């Protein structure tokens, strides 16, 4: 015991996904992130809501990390999901990721990290 009927831990997890969303809004601001800040976003490829080139998604069965630093365009962070253009083998491609699909967040500059979808 004791069984948590309030699911405080789950609510704290969702609350924290919001930091990713807030960080992506500063990154979407004209001028981008304040250097040397950059982001590493890891998400579940099969999670509902995520869209991307069929070829690309097939390459990454479950997890996929993307880095937002030197090569990303048109970052559009909506209220429930964000979309961005990145390059794979020099080829630009679009991605849409729900904040719900997120599993990890990391900014190497200040070593700040977050881990989600993990109830442990």
């Amino acid at each position: 015991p004791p069984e948590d009927l309030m699911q405080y831990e789950a609510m704290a997890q969702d609350a924290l996904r919001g930091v990713v969303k807030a960080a992506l809004k500063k990154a979407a601001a004209p001028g981008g992130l304040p250097e040397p800040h950059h982001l590493y976003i890891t998400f579940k490829t099969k999670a509902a809501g995520v869209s991307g080139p069929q070829d690309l998604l097939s390459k990454y069965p479950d997890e996929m990390t993307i880095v937002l630093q030197h090569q990303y365009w048109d970052l559009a962070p909506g209220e429930t999901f964000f979309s961005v253009t990145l390059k794979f083998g020099g080829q630009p491609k679009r991605l849409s990721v729900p904040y719900a699909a997120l599993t990890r967040f990391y900014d190497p500059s200040v070593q700040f990290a977050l881990q989600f979808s993990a109830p442990e």
Binding site: Y40, T65, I66, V67, H70, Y72, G89
Partner: peptide
């Protein structure tokens, strides 16, 4: 880490 997208600085 292990990013999937290209990230070489310029």
């Amino acid at each position: 880490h292990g990013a999937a997208n290209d990230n070489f600085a310029e």
